[PDB]
Amino acid sequence: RRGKPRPRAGMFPDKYRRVPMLLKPQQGGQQYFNHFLIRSTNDRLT
Amino acid sequence: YYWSRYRMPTQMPKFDGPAPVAAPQSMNSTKTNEFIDPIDDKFPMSIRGPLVRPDVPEDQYVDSWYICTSMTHHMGDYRPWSASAPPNAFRFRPFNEFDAKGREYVQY
Amino acid sequence: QGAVATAEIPAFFNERPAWERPPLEETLYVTTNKERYDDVRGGDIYYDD
Amino acid sequence: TDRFANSLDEYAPYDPEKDSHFHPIQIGNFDEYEYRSFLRFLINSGELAGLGWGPLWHASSDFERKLYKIGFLSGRNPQGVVDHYHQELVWRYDYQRTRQKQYLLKRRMEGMSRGA
Amino acid sequence: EGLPVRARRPIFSSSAEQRIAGGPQRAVIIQYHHQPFFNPEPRLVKVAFQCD
Amino acid sequence: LEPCTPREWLQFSHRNLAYAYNGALRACHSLPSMLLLYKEMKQRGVKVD
Amino acid sequence: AKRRVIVPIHPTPNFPAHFIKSAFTTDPLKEKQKARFSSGGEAMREVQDIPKNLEGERSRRDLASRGDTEFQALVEFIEGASYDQLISGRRFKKVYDVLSENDDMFIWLCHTAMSVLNPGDMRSRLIYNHLRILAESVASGEMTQRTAFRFFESAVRSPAYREIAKRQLEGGAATRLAGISAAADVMRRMGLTRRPMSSYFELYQRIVERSEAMTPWGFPPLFQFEERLSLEPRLKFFSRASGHVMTPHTTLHGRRIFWIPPTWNRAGRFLGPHVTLYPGMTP
Amino acid sequence: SNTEHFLDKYEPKRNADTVADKYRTTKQITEIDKWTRYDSARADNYRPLSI
Amino acid sequence: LSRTITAEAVGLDNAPGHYTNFLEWMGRLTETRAFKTEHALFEFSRRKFNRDDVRVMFENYRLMSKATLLADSADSYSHFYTVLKDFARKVAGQIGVRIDEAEVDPETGIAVGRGCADGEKYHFTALLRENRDHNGIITVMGKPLSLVLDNKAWLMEMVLMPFDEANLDYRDFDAHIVSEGHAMPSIANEIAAFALRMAVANALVKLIPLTRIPLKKSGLLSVDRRRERGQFPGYLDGKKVKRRFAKR
Amino acid sequence: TDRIRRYFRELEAVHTSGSASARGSGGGTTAEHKQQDQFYSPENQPISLHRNN
Amino acid sequence: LSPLEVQRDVGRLEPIPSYAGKINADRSVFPFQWKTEDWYEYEVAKVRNRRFVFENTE
């Protein structure tokens, strides 16, 4: 800050500390799971 | 006198004896808080909870003047959440049908 | 114990029950509440004469 | 940033019926048939002309998904359809090619574990 | 529901702003909604008049 | 556990209690010890699976 | 040098003597030092650890109706889950201290079982009585663990002991079963624990954990037992215990149990522990 | 049980039920609430004539 | 039981110290009730539990009468077992997501969710109903979603998302969203969009209860707490920038 | 040692997914497990949990 | 089936909600859509009139 060196990055509280774990990253595409499961089972039988 | 009011009604407890268990006492370089309880903050949160004060509806709490802390406006007494709502209220509620917003827009 | 709050209220709420105290004090005893003239190191600065 | 700079200042309402002697015909948005044929044209014929994803085709999702999503965005309005076809480039939240990739991969590696 | 009640029979006229009230008649409560959001002010009671 | 505080009301549901009771059901090796648990989960309203 | 002149204050109806000498000092090189701590009845009874004396009828009545303290401590910890209280690290400390009251006694016994090659046959009434007596003397503080251990190994067993040991052992290490069954037996027949199993369990457990340690059954002579310098409580041998830039100025700012809560003179911008500044939305 | 359910037949016998719960849970009414110093000090819910 | 039975069918032994018999007996008591109680108390001493185990222990305690205590203080152990039972069962030995019922107005078939961002700036409330005619539309403050978020696709897809994660068709649903926060001429920007998404999603869960499981996993229902820093005179721009510093 | 660990972790992994033939409406996994765990998550099949991909 | 008639619990069979395919669709009822001018006039008017009340009524 004043006439002193800026701290190293890890010396600060987490930038995303207030954003819940589910959000980083978003897991989206839940719609496709079932589809790809049935798909893989049918495949197996083939 | 006008100061006759401000006499001590009872005898104050003497300070007879040593520091209480696990008091802050300070050696060479020691960062010391008289304020923070030594034993109960050092306790892990997963066990005790994030709670500072008993978990109860906040209408029973008032933010104190001049002290940073809260107090009960009925001193020391507590009513559990179950006594705020009607008997057997789902997610204690005025009524079980909807939440706040739901009640309001249904009403609308 | 110590005092949380203080209020001026008439003495007939709590006063030593009639059978504990000496008989009629108004008639048989002349009592003045007064202050000690000396310095008192401890105790009450008002005594009953 | 403005879409409208070349638009007229009018702000005044107009009815074909009272304001002209011609017979009014009413045009709507595309319905799903029109809409489908159209979007198919823009995308696929676009690519064939080399105006679209090309070698990057695995980045954007498949036709169906696009059709459905552009459907929602535009509301089937033709100007809107054109425009969101373009804006499709920047879609952040589409997960499909991701999970499809993931699946294809896992199946390949099960094939390599059945081979070995 | 099921409670015997004497309700002032509402009388319907177009000619009347607001509403018209009439003499009490015997009726049973069909349903009564307590929750302020099912039964806004002024409160209502669905009732079955015994007469007709 | 019956919820006490709102925070607990958020961990609670009948449909999930189903899972719990199913676990406690697969545990028991004899039918008669099961019929008790089932009687309970039937009585206290619980979504059944 | 313009030395500050402080006028002494005399006791007052609201300003008693001890208050004065504790809260006021006339020597102004002693201002602004730090805070001092004291105790009254219960915190003093804890700290000072004055063992009560047996006395006339009330003390014996209180010995009689005493009941189980180990269960009481636990109840009082658990009760912090009641809606109107918190969960206390002090209640847990008291719990802990009652669970471990004996503790080191067990520790001692471990050493007699595992730390001694060839302690004779430990089933025979003789060596058994040695062990019994020494144990009862480690408990009740009559002897130091060091002294009791050095007693135990130097206790009298049988004439020409080594030469009889050459008729059983090669390198002089007997089998440890008799020793453990003995050392559990003593603690059971001595009244050492309120609940019977605890003796056996603790003695067994403490051995099983040490089994995995490098050179498990040997110990440095100085750290093995009570001596002037000791090991830190994690490393003791059979023991039960085996922003970031702004944080020093933050301090108070977490969820913090307090002792004395801060006041407006001593803390400028702090709002109290309960305060949630960046609240989330919850149903 | 009011109506006998058809699954009553297979309900286990009371042998080795020494744990029997209906009797473990049952409390004397004296045990349910304590009279505290708060209760001695309790205000009146009606408005008093003269205190 | 089999083990016990043979152990006592064999009896005493010719081993010198009755060695295999102390083996036997010492082993046997490892599976005893009291031993397990002890193991629990030991793990307890080491702080291996959490709050919930405590409240579980608590309500296990509350269930006893004074008489139950008096009967189980006899063994000097078993009451520790009554209390610690489930903690013990835990040491020596999981609800996924909350599945509710539906909150819906019986008459209007409308459900009501609420999203938010910056705790202040954006509060929205989604009214959601199901359209049997398959023409759905979404509307914000009485205006078509297209115009409100202003044709920027990357904003509107956010509002589309919960219909995807629930594996549903958007055309079967009508939504109108209400602004309860700071109103502004334009709410089109990503933060407000985020809020909108959260709103619609919470509505959808109220309407289709099981749909709550995928949504939650995809982190729609999750609320982030973030705010602009409060205004403040100390900083130049009023927020983050400290004033100029000069060496004396 | 770690080699062994990994070999036998991936092996029974391939017998969780490779045992799926009649698993589609088969007994091998609970109905409630069909309910909760059949969704993409950090332990199941995350997209990437890490920055700089 | 409309999305409200679909059985989404693998484990349970649930009574179809009585509003399922019943409530019909008209822009007039819902979703709410409106002209702006009327919205302005509504709002302003609703602020102006807070104090116009007859408390005492027959």
Side-chain angles (χ1 to χ4, degrees):
Chain A
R1 270 175 156 170
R2 34 166 61 189
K4 294 193 171 181
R6 248 212 129 186
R8 70 213 197 77
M11 263 282 91
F12 290 107
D14 230 339
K15 176 164 245 173
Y16 297 98
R17 100 192 85 118
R18 278 190 215 104
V19 182
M21 277 294 178
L22 278 169
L23 246 35
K24 42 195 206 259
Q26 282 218 2
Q27 265 318 310
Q30 308 285 337
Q31 5 149 16
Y32 295 140
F33 196 117
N34 211 51
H35 175 38
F36 286 155
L37 202 53
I38 268 87
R39 266 264 224 158
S40 73
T41 299
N42 157 274
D43 286 15
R44 157 84 61 275
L45 291 187
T46 303
Chain B
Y1 310 76
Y2 272 164
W3 294 6
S4 287
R5 181 180 200 128
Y6 301 108
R7 312 171 299 152
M8 287 258 65
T10 338
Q11 228 222 142
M12 284 320 115
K14 357 246 63 180
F15 328 115
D16 290 309
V21 194
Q25 50 181 238
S26 53
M27 341 272 333
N28 285 36
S29 72
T30 294
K31 311 168 187 184
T32 294
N33 244 316
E34 342 130 4
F35 297 142
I36 292 188
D37 178 308
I39 299 190
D40 283 8
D41 239 74
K42 177 54 192 165
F43 213 40
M45 302 279 292
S46 63
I47 304 186
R48 74 164 214 253
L51 316 183
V52 172
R53 58 189 187 184
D55 175 24
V56 122
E58 321 82 33
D59 332 315
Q60 302 182 38
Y61 291 117
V62 203
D63 298 357
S64 306
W65 157 83
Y66 206 87
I67 318 180
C68 350
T69 201
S70 61
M71 282 159 53
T72 340
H73 67 245
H74 52 284
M75 44 205 61
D77 201 314
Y78 292 94
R79 307 274 167 263
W81 288 85
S82 90
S84 312
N88 310 277
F90 169 86
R91 293 188 185 182
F92 324 93
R93 259 182 202 176
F95 320 90
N96 318 74
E97 333 278 348
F98 307 99
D99 41 322
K101 273 288 116 57
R103 277 187 244 93
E104 181 194 357
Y105 270 83
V106 162
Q107 199 176 355
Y108 273 165
Chain C
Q1 286 170 316
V4 177
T6 301
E8 314 184 336
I9 56 176
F12 61 72
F13 277 108
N14 37 240
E15 59 183 346
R16 242 157 82 267
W19 59 97
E20 284 194 21
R21 56 190 179 189
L24 13 82
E25 293 178 357
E26 34 210 330
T27 286
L28 288 186
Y29 295 84
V30 191
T31 291
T32 297
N33 196 18
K34 51 176 74 168
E35 187 169 5
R36 300 213 173 280
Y37 270 53
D38 353 29
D39 178 29
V40 270
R41 197 64 177 181
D44 192 17
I45 71 158
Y46 290 101
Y47 75 94
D48 253 24
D49 205 348
Chain D
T1 300
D2 176 36
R3 308 140 61 169
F4 303 102
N6 300 106
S7 313
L8 312 155
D9 332 17
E10 280 305 84
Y11 322 107
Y14 178 94
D15 176 58
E17 223 236 29
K18 295 174 193 173
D19 296 280
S20 63
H21 300 279
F22 322 106
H23 180 70
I25 312 183
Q26 259 175 24
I27 259 194
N29 294 332
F30 295 158
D31 58 17
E32 305 105 302
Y33 300 131
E34 301 169 295
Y35 166 46
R36 181 178 292 269
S37 282
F38 189 55
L39 190 51
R40 175 63 80 181
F41 169 72
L42 278 181
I43 303 183
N44 278 8
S45 78
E47 257 143 7
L48 231 175
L51 273 177
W53 287 108
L56 260 171
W57 64 280
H58 48 275
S60 83
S61 44
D62 94 276
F63 186 74
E64 275 313 284
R65 173 65 191 193
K66 289 171 182 179
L67 186 98
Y68 173 81
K69 182 159 169 200
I70 283 180
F72 169 85
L73 293 171
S74 52
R76 299 203 277 278
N77 176 265
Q79 178 48 61
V81 159
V82 156
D83 190 22
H84 280 296
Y85 151 72
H86 284 326
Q87 263 177 28
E88 187 223 286
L89 155 80
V90 214
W91 291 354
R92 291 174 181 192
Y93 280 114
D94 218 77
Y95 284 98
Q96 169 179 111
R97 282 287 186 256
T98 283
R99 301 299 187 178
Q100 194 188 346
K101 279 173 184 188
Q102 205 190 29
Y103 164 69
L104 300 190
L105 176 66
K106 176 237 235 45
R107 174 241 275 156
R108 158 172 294 155
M109 272 199 44
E110 265 187 12
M112 281 196 70
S113 75
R114 280 181 207 97
Chain E
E1 170 193 9
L3 205 71
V5 141
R6 289 220 303 197
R8 297 171 52 65
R9 175 64 162 270
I11 290 288
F12 297 110
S13 180
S14 70
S15 189
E17 301 203 355
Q18 312 294 297
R19 77 171 199 280
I20 295 184
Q25 286 188 324
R26 313 185 320 256
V28 203
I29 286 183
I30 276 175
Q31 70 155 7
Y32 176 81
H33 290 312
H34 295 73
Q35 28 280 308
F37 49 93
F38 284 174
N39 207 28
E41 306 292 341
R43 288 185 165 271
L44 285 190
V45 184
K46 179 179 293 178
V47 114
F49 289 88
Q50 249 251 166
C51 190
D52 35 330
Chain F
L1 282 184
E2 295 182 310
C4 159
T5 255
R7 217 264 175 161
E8 305 168 19
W9 261 112
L10 298 196
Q11 316 281 13
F12 181 88
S13 271
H14 290 330
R15 183 53 198 131
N16 290 264
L17 273 195
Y19 306 161
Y21 277 110
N22 288 156
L25 233 42
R26 280 182 232 102
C28 331
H29 3 71
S30 64
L31 174 61
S33 58
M34 263 164 32
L35 253 19
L36 206 62
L37 227 38
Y38 165 81
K39 173 172 185 172
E40 175 170 59
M41 79 147 83
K42 185 175 60 180
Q43 193 184 323
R44 137 197 240 189
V46 158
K47 308 299 210 169
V48 186
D49 237 342
Chain G
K2 202 179 169 182
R3 269 179 172 177
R4 213 215 212 115
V5 174
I6 296 190
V7 192
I9 304 160
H10 320 285
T12 295
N14 32 28
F15 205 1
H18 50 300
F19 269 27
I20 287 187
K21 99 164 175 291
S22 72
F24 183 78
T25 275
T26 327
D27 327 337
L29 304 187
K30 256 177 307 164
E31 278 187 6
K32 314 178 179 194
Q33 38 179 292
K34 214 148 185 167
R36 278 187 203 138
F37 280 69
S38 295
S39 64
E42 266 210 11
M44 199 180 54
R45 282 184 216 98
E46 282 181 37
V47 169
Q48 281 187 331
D49 256 342
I50 327 138
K52 313 166 183 178
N53 283 346
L54 198 51
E55 284 168 20
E57 300 171 33
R58 280 198 214 139
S59 299
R60 332 204 128 180
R61 245 186 256 146
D62 269 319
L63 252 207
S65 70
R66 180 158 273 187
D68 329 340
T69 313
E70 315 183 306
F71 187 59
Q72 267 319 291
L74 187 84
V75 164
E76 294 184 18
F77 167 85
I78 262 170
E79 285 262 39
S82 167
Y83 73 97
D84 49 334
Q85 312 161 34
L86 312 157
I87 302 181
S88 150
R90 295 181 168 283
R91 293 290 168 67
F92 179 80
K93 190 203 171 193
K94 188 213 155 182
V95 162
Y96 179 77
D97 298 339
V98 180
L99 282 178
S100 75
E101 175 81 34
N102 302 311
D103 223 52
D104 99 313
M105 148 64 44
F106 303 97
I107 288 177
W108 184 77
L109 284 170
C110 293
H111 281 102
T112 51
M114 303 307 293
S115 184
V116 162
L117 297 80
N118 190 16
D121 164 43
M122 291 261 18
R123 190 129 163 279
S124 59
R125 294 325 291 161
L126 182 64
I127 311 189
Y128 185 94
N129 270 335
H130 292 332
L131 189 68
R132 176 171 74 94
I133 296 323
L134 295 160
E136 280 126 30
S137 274
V138 165
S140 72
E142 295 166 23
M143 285 182 59
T144 12
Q145 286 174 353
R146 191 172 293 279
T147 306
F149 186 66
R150 276 227 46 84
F151 245 105
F152 175 62
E153 31 185 30
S154 44
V156 67
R157 262 134 215 193
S158 85
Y161 179 71
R162 302 191 199 182
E163 300 225 290
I164 288 180
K166 283 196 299 188
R167 274 156 180 68
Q168 283 144 42
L169 330 163
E170 277 180 354
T175 66
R176 305 271 62 90
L177 189 44
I180 302 182
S181 55
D185 211 319
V186 148
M187 277 185 297
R188 179 250 299 165
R189 273 185 31 186
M190 155 176 59
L192 192 91
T193 43
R194 178 174 292 280
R195 35 190 207 285
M197 189 56 64
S198 44
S199 64
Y200 179 89
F201 170 74
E202 292 225 330
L203 172 56
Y204 173 96
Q205 192 54 41
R206 289 178 200 267
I207 285 163
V208 184
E209 290 157 0
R210 182 83 195 159
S211 306
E212 324 305 322
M214 158 60 156
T215 184
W217 317 115
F219 310 96
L222 283 90
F223 282 164
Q224 180 174 345
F225 293 115
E226 30 218 6
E227 225 289 338
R228 207 197 176 189
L229 252 50
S230 70
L231 274 179
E232 54 182 33
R234 172 171 66 88
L235 265 28
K236 290 176 183 312
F237 275 112
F238 284 91
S239 74
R240 210 190 285 267
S242 16
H244 241 27
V245 128
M246 277 271 194
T247 158
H249 315 315
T250 272
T251 10
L252 308 166
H253 270 183
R255 288 279 188 263
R256 301 268 156 169
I257 320 296
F258 284 139
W259 215 352
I260 321 306
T263 20
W264 282 13
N265 40 324
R266 297 243 22 244
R269 292 167 170 183
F270 178 59
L271 303 181
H274 59 290
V275 192
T276 307
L277 263 328
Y278 299 97
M281 189 208 66
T282 330
Chain H
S1 48
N2 30 356
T3 296
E4 275 239 324
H5 190 65
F6 60 87
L7 274 183
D8 239 315
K9 324 171 180 179
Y10 314 101
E11 262 189 355
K13 290 311 160 188
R14 281 286 164 164
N15 334 328
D17 210 337
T18 287
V19 219
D21 269 39
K22 293 252 172 172
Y23 314 122
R24 273 178 120 265
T25 309
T26 305
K27 297 190 181 182
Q28 183 168 77
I29 62 171
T30 302
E31 185 191 345
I32 301 186
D33 30 70
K34 341 205 161 199
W35 180 265
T36 340
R37 117 278 175 92
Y38 288 96
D39 294 322
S40 322
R42 181 81 55 214
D44 334 318
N45 50 1
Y46 75 106
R47 158 181 280 104
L49 178 59
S50 162
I51 76 165
Chain I
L1 184 62
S2 62
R3 281 198 227 95
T4 286
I5 293 189
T6 290
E8 93 166 3
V10 163
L12 280 300
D13 38 357
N14 284 125
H18 295 286
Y19 185 83
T20 98
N21 248 343
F22 282 81
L23 280 178
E24 210 307 291
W25 169 78
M26 264 192 183
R28 142 144 46 172
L29 72 77
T30 282
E31 66 196 13
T32 312
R33 215 149 147 266
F35 186 92
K36 282 164 193 167
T37 285
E38 277 300 328
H39 197 12
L41 268 164
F42 194 66
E43 281 304 293
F44 186 88
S45 294
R46 295 176 179 249
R47 310 197 304 189
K48 290 294 174 51
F49 52 99
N50 41 328
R51 195 194 199 282
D52 305 84
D53 275 318
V54 185
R55 92 172 279 250
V56 163
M57 291 160 71
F58 176 43
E59 267 124 33
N60 250 326
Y61 171 65
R62 299 234 48 233
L63 265 169
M64 313 209 233
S65 71
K66 89 232 178 184
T68 315
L69 286 192
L70 236 196
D72 287 338
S73 186
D75 333 310
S76 57
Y77 83 96
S78 89
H79 59 263
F80 274 104
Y81 180 72
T82 291
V83 169
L84 262 58
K85 172 141 58 166
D86 309 308
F87 180 50
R89 225 182 67 202
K90 224 211 54 175
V91 144
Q94 307 199 7
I95 24 181
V97 192
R98 197 179 59 247
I99 298 171
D100 313 12
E101 297 171 4
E103 299 187 343
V104 206
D105 191 339
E107 282 228 340
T108 339
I110 305 193
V112 184
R114 14 134 80 235
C116 45
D118 293 79
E120 284 288 33
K121 250 211 167 181
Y122 309 103
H123 283 106
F124 296 107
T125 299
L127 292 212
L128 190 72
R129 191 216 270 177
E130 180 259 12
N131 188 340
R132 63 175 194 179
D133 287 22
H134 213 94
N135 334 324
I137 189 177
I138 311 196
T139 310
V140 193
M141 288 310 296
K143 257 50 171 253
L145 184 68
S146 320
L147 165 65
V148 146
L149 295 190
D150 194 63
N151 230 31
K152 299 176 172 164
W154 67 93
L155 294 197
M156 308 185 54
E157 72 174 320
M158 289 194 80
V159 164
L160 185 55
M161 246 184 109
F163 296 105
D164 300 306
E165 306 295 342
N167 197 15
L168 293 174
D169 194 353
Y170 84 87
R171 299 179 66 201
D172 275 321
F173 296 106
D174 314 310
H176 167 274
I177 342 262
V178 179
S179 161
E180 263 143 340
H182 301 348
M184 52 195 62
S186 179
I187 64 172
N189 69 77
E190 299 173 32
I191 307 178
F194 184 95
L196 276 161
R197 185 234 271 158
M198 181 186 306
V200 160
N202 264 117
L204 198 46
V205 160
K206 307 286 188 184
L207 188 65
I208 316 282
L210 274 150
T211 252
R212 196 190 121 115
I213 299 175
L215 292 186
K216 177 77 164 297
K217 292 244 179 175
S218 49
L220 290 207
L221 295 204
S222 118
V223 177
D224 77 314
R225 346 171 252 108
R226 293 205 274 169
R227 293 170 182 249
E228 315 179 9
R229 307 177 69 183
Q231 65 83 36
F232 185 79
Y235 299 97
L236 284 175
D237 52 347
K239 312 285 184 170
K240 84 203 295 160
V241 173
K242 289 197 58 171
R243 292 194 148 80
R244 273 266 228 84
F245 166 66
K247 28 189 178 185
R248 189 165 288 194
Chain J
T1 287
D2 203 44
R3 280 178 65 176
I4 308 179
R5 296 275 162 57
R6 263 190 287 114
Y7 187 108
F8 286 116
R9 92 170 57 269
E10 74 78 52
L11 233 186
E12 53 93 3
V14 101
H15 281 342
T16 61
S17 297
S19 303
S21 60
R23 144 162 289 109
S25 55
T29 211
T30 340
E32 80 95 334
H33 172 292
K34 297 169 160 63
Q35 204 161 146
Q36 303 289 329
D37 302 316
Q38 259 166 47
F39 300 90
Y40 285 121
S41 35
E43 58 274 357
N44 232 314
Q45 302 193 51
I47 40 161
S48 154
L49 291 195
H50 293 285
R51 177 198 208 78
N52 288 328
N53 282 316
Chain K
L1 307 183
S2 83
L4 271 48
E5 317 158 36
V6 172
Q7 293 286 333
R8 278 134 199 285
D9 196 340
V10 295
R12 288 205 90 234
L13 210 44
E14 284 124 331
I16 299 187
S18 72
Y19 42 85
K22 304 219 185 160
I23 284 139
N24 69 307
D26 356 85
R27 305 296 201 206
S28 20
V29 168
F30 184 85
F32 307 126
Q33 206 157 23
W34 64 54
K35 273 174 181 166
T36 326
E37 334 199 348
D38 301 22
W39 177 39
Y40 279 13
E41 175 187 343
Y42 185 97
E43 280 297 334
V44 174
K46 186 172 185 179
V47 182
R48 299 294 180 73
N49 285 251
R50 203 206 299 174
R51 289 199 54 242
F52 295 81
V53 188
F54 230 71
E55 303 279 351
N56 302 124
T57 308
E58 304 172 2

